[PDB]
Design an enzyme around this catalytic site. Structure first.
Site, PDB file in Angstrom:
ATOM      1  N   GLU A 168       6.503   7.686 -41.846  1.00  0.00           N
ATOM      2  CA  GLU A 168       6.674   7.407 -43.265  1.00  0.00           C
ATOM      3  C   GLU A 168       6.061   6.055 -43.598  1.00  0.00           C
ATOM      4  OE1 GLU A 168       9.194   7.700 -41.093  1.00  0.00           O
ATOM      5  OE2 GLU A 168      10.779   6.235 -41.505  1.00  0.00           O
TER       6      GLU A 168
ATOM      7  N   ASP B 119      20.696  17.759  -3.554  1.00  0.00           N
ATOM      8  CA  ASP B 119      20.988  16.354  -3.220  1.00  0.00           C
ATOM      9  C   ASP B 119      19.972  15.285  -3.605  1.00  0.00           C
ATOM     10  OD1 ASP B 119      23.483  17.079  -2.296  1.00  0.00           O
ATOM     11  OD2 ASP B 119      22.915  17.014  -0.183  1.00  0.00           O
TER      12      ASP B 119
ATOM     13  N   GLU C 173      17.549  15.817  -9.334  1.00  0.00           N
ATOM     14  CA  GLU C 173      18.502  16.023 -10.430  1.00  0.00           C
ATOM     15  C   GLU C 173      17.771  16.319 -11.734  1.00  0.00           C
ATOM     16  OE1 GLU C 173      22.244  15.956 -10.206  1.00  0.00           O
ATOM     17  OE2 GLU C 173      21.578  17.082 -11.957  1.00  0.00           O
TER      18      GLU C 173
ATOM     19  N   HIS D 151      30.775  13.803  -1.580  1.00  0.00           N
ATOM     20  CA  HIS D 151      30.175  14.267  -2.823  1.00  0.00           C
ATOM     21  C   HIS D 151      31.229  14.899  -3.729  1.00  0.00           C
ATOM     22  CE1 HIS D 151      26.019  14.842  -0.621  1.00  0.00           C
ATOM     23  NE2 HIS D 151      26.392  13.576  -0.708  1.00  0.00           N
TER      24      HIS D 151
ATOM     25  N   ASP E 253      30.700  17.142  -5.817  1.00  0.00           N
ATOM     26  CA  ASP E 253      30.488  18.589  -5.935  1.00  0.00           C
ATOM     27  C   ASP E 253      31.141  19.409  -4.832  1.00  0.00           C
ATOM     28  OD1 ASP E 253      28.646  18.546  -3.801  1.00  0.00           O
ATOM     29  OD2 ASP E 253      26.908  18.911  -5.051  1.00  0.00           O
TER      30      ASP E 253
ATOM     31  N   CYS F  11      21.675  25.146   2.721  1.00  0.00           N
ATOM     32  CA  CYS F  11      20.980  25.617   1.543  1.00  0.00           C
ATOM     33  C   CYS F  11      21.389  24.770   0.377  1.00  0.00           C
ATOM     34  CB  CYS F  11      21.422  27.045   1.220  1.00  0.00           C
ATOM     35  SG  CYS F  11      21.208  28.151   2.545  1.00  0.00           S
TER      36      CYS F  11
HETATM   37 CA   LIG Z   1      24.334  16.819  -9.027  1.00  0.00          CA
HETATM   38 CA   LIG Z   2       9.578   9.832 -40.410  1.00  0.00          CA
END
Ligand SMILES: [Ca+2]
Ligand SMILES: [Ca+2]
Ligand SMILES: [Ca+2]
Ligand SMILES: [Ca+2]
Lengths: 645, 645
Positions: free
Chosen positions: B129, B337, B340, B448, B450, B624
């Site tokens: 703008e 691991d 991410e 971890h 998880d 895995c």
């Molecule tokens: Ca993770």
């Molecule tokens: Ca704008």
């Protein structure tokens, strides 16, 4: 605050309950295999609800009610009062199989309820309220909350309650029976990062007297606190070790945890944690509009006129005069250049705090008095406190700066010129409440903003003026006096080392290069005028121009031709103004008369102070300095709402 | 924005006027000595007011009006349109003495008006703008404003408009005559501090083609920009070089200045400066409730059941499967691991951005595809992305976290245990919009989060559940099955390297030390449950407990006894769950049946995935890994209002 406590299959569970929390209790895991239903009993001061699929039902102390066993059917356990020695606080659950109403097993929970709260004065009245629910947050503004810490500005031991009188109080309040149950302790702690920001003192052994020991700080991140039964309070004193800065917001945290002993070589479990935050109060500068308390002066012992005239000025006021002389490690202006008066404030206390930056370093420094907190620190002239000023409170584009704004001299960004050191600029910026602005001082040989500008209150009002040095004003005045037939009027009268130069108005006005140099300096001044107007929200009505004149050096920078009048002692209506030694017309200095005509109609009373006669000439350097210590603002800094950093 | 321009005694002043400003003009200094009054004339497109003591009066182009000369009587000069070659824009002031009406002198101001605006998309719609009046500030929230920059995540040259397609646009818009007046130039610049945060590209020589040159960034703090007459736009492309971090807020600034040449060896004067600020968009993590796009898997090439079963799972969905194998520099779980998936977003564009932390360091890494931005980095197991999770959007105590909150495994503060590295924790914290929370993972050998927790959407609603590993749930289930006469039911059926152990339910339930170890692990789990409930605003209705069992090592930390089912592939209603290999009852795994009974009634569809059979046994390690790339949140991050940092 819900906490998980499970009944143990084949054993009783004993647990500490901390008031302000409640337990959710799994009864399903402790049920023997094959059990169908359960019932429960509990003591008078334990409240128990059966919660089935989120629906809670209060249960009587001894009822016969039975519920189906199910992972989704749990207990909610609450207590509203701490245990005493007369307490037996418990919940007992009985289990039943499909056939028959006699319990096949029972699991139980024995509770000791204690109150634990780490309390601070978060509501900022100077007294430590009980468990302020906002104590773990710090918010700015009039409705803002959270506790305030002062830096200890007075530069493995024992202290009395007297030495700690200026620190902040923090109180650990507890309520409970004679002792914690086996395997619990209470520990106060801080993070490693905060360990250089704070210190905490406590009496470790009150039976031996109250000897305050430093228990948290550098190298000590935790302290085990002894539990006293009944209603008890442990009093801690807390100090900040440093001001906010680049990388330190000013916020620190202190925690207390009830820790449960698991077994040897297992870490202890944090059963309950309570947190208080502090903000370390920022260093704040006082503008010329604040009431003067003391006037500090430094000069050589034999500059007699300066001392007599400053003394006479101060005698017109209620201020105290403090006279200081010169020192081996310091410049001739040091009280102005190396020393800066500011203050810090907490709800309970505040005092003045002086920043000290000695030219050659420190060689004992007070000598300023015990009433002041004291803080001492590749440098250029721009690093001087002569290069640091602060405006009166202003409002700009609707944003209020209730404490004013700090002004710092600098050079243009692409200029490759001089700049105040980053560490000092970062410090001033991090205090946040004075929102600093950089001006352009680098066109000056010395490079101090106080050479070109100052502020004065307008007597009988809440308003103020910006005073600006102006070469254009001087040239206008000299040209008028010349036109009036005064061209031979001489300057520097009474300075014997200037006499052979025989400087008159004609001689000044005919010097062509000096004219061009001063047109340029006026551009430098006007560039500043514009920044000041923008950043302080000033119009031309707020500004008075004082005549000034400069000579240019080889770097194209300015030094005063005659003393800069703008750098003046402002004590309310009374202004000590450096004596200019201007051209004499009708036996009066035309510069003095012009300045009186500008200032006096506003009710400002002018006194010209001679700091140069003792030297017999003026080369652009001033050998004296002054600084005024002032009352802090009435507005509390913590009521400000600064922009997001 | 008022700017000071003085008429010059004995010369004409020529000045550039920048639209959006106005001039205050001293006419009094240029008046000859002895002059009394002044009059003025001006051209058609210059507006002139006489301002006497703050009172302004518009003046005609050629009038005869006269005013008394006085320091407090000034001019205000404004122009509303830029100059063209047809312009003569001027103000002329004539001076008069006391006697007579013919001018004794005249001073004048010749103006060239130009428009200069550095424009960015501050209103965050993807188009730039004209001169957004808020462009110099950056504010959070739905009504917030200021421009957004993306980090260049693709790891002295020439670029086309294609290579820069993903950067932010910044446009210098100008309007004026054929050339700037003598002694002016226009310069784009940044601070030294920002020089490692940004880069800016431009076509220096468009007559030679459009070859984009890097003009601002490391080592280049300024660039002189050529002025084109008429209405002109210069298009710059801007890139961020790094994410917010400890010590970098995310904010950067770019300036343009019109500089006036004074003389040789004098710095140029910044006549006008325009500033735009950018915020570099933060790296954002995707929770399990966001729609899955691609499923990434890694395993050894011969784990055939895993690959077949994962493929069958994904075929139930509309997701793509990407299969990756093992690498010399990476762990067996590396896709989980060391990698991410996250995203960054600007109003105009966004894409996914992968964080990469290779175990042994990088040895080329994509191989992940061109669609992703890619960012690669004394370490412990807690530094793994297996130790990083993010919650679905939550509201806690009335505070919304529309992007969820990042969860990171840690140890108790006083424990002396392991902790994710500060640099990574600081990074996550500095992104601000996911407001991270530390959990306790250090009771786990690998450490971890998880391993013990996950999140799943509840199908057909906007709600979600927290899934928690529970040893108590497992013991309850095994005790039931034993009571049912199933005590000799064997685990690990089909794993030949476990057979000689002959592990049954009886053998598990009779191991006394294992019982005590698992009671302790349940305490560790429950400590987490409580933090999660507090910090995510969850009740017991939001949580399902999955049976798990652990063995303890010499450090008193846990490893899985059988595969942890909680670490699962969540694709909307379809869940790939690690096959537990639990005790067989009626030729079905009682763990699988129990989990189905918990999840299926909610419309969650369970698929058990065998990742261990190819290894013939299970020692607590999984060979895995999986990771799911998801669609970013619909909510724009810049609409969030994060707490003051
Ligand atoms: Ca993770
Ligand atoms: Ca704008
Ligand atoms: Ca209080
Ligand atoms: Ca100062």
């Amino acid at each position: 605050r819900e906490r998980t406590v499970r009944l143990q299959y084949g054993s009783r569970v004993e647990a500490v309950y901390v008031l302000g929390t409640y337990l959710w209790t799994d009864v399903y895991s402790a049920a023997p295999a094959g059990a169908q239903t359960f019932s429960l009993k509990h003591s008078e001061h334990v409240w128990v609800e059966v919660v089935r699929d989120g629906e809670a039902e209060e249960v009587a102390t001894n009822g016969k009610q039975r519920w189906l066993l199910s992972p989704s059917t749990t207990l909610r356990v609450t207590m509203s009062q701490a245990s005493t020695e007369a307490s037996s606080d418990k919940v007992t659950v009985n289990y039943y199989d499909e056939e028959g109403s006699i319990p096949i097993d029972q699991a139980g929970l024995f509770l000791t309820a204690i109150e634990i709260s780490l309390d601070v004065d978060a509501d900022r009245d100077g007294v430590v309220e009980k468990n302020n629910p906002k104590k773990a947050s710090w918010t700015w503004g009039p409705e803002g909350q959270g506790a305030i810490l002062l830096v200890n500005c007075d530069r493995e031991k024992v202290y009395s309650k007297e030495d700690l009188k200026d620190m902040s109080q923090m109180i650990l309040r507890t309520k409970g029976p004679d002792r914690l149950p086996a395997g619990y302790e209470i520990v106060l702690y801080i993070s490693m990062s905060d360990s250089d920001k704070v210190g905490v003192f406590y009496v470790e052994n009150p039976f031996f007297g109250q000897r305050y020991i430093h228990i948290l700080g550098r190298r000590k991140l935790y302290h085990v606190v002894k539990y006293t039964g009944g209603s008890a309070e442990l009093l801690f004193f807390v100090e900040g070790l440093c001001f906010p800065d680049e990388g330190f917001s000013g916020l620190v945290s202190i925690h207390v945890s009830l820790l449960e002993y698991m077994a040897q070589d297992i870490p202890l479990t944090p059963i309950f944690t309570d947190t208080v935050i502090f903000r370390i109060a920022p260093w704040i500068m006082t503008p010329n509009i604040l009431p003067p308390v003391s006037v500090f002066v430094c000069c050589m012992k034999d500059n007699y006129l300066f001392l007599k005239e400053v003394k006479n000025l101060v005698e017109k006021t209620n201020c105290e005069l403090k006279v200081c002389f010169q020192y081996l490690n310091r410049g001739d202006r040091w009280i102005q250049d190396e020393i800066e008066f500011g203050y810090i404030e907490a709800p309970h206390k505040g005092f003045p705090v002086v920043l000290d930056s000695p030219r050659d370093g420190n060689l004992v420094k007070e000598l300023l008095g015990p009433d002041f907190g004291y803080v001492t620190r590749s440098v250029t002239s721009l690093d001087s406190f002569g290069n640091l000023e602060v405006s009166p409170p202003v409002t700009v584009n609707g944003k209020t700066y209730p404490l004013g704004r700090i002004l710092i001299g600098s050079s243009f960004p692409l200029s490759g010129g001089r700049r105040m050191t980053k560490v000092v600029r970062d410090f001033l910026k991090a205090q946040q409440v004075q929102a600093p602005v950089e001006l352009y001082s680098d066109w000056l040989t010395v490079g101090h903003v106080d050479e070109f500008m100052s502020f004065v209150p307008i007597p009988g009002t809440k308003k103020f003026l910006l005073l600006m040095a102006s070469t254009s004003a001087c040239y206008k005045l000299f040209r008028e006096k010349q036109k009036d037939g005064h061209g031979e009027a001489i300057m520097f009268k009474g300075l014997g080392g200037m006499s052979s130069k025989r400087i008159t108005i004609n001689k000044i006005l005919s010097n062509e290069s000096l004219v061009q140099e001063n047109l340029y300096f006026q551009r430098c001044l006007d560039w500043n005028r514009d920044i000041l107007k923008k950043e302080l929200g000033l119009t031309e009505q707020d500004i008075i121009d004082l005549p000034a004149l400069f000579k240019m050096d080889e770097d194209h920078r300015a030094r005063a031709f005659f003393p800069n009048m703008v750098n003046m002692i402002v004590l309310d209506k009374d202004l000590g103004i450096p004596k200019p030694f201007g051209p004499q017309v009708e036996e009066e200095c035309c510069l003095e008369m012009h300045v009186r005509g500008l200032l006096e109609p506003l009710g400002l009373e002018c006194t010209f102070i001679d700091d140069i006669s003792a030297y017999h000439k003026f080369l652009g350097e001033v050998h004296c300095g002054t600084n005024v210590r002032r009352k802090p603002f009435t507005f509390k800094w913590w009521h400000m709402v600064p922009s997001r950093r």
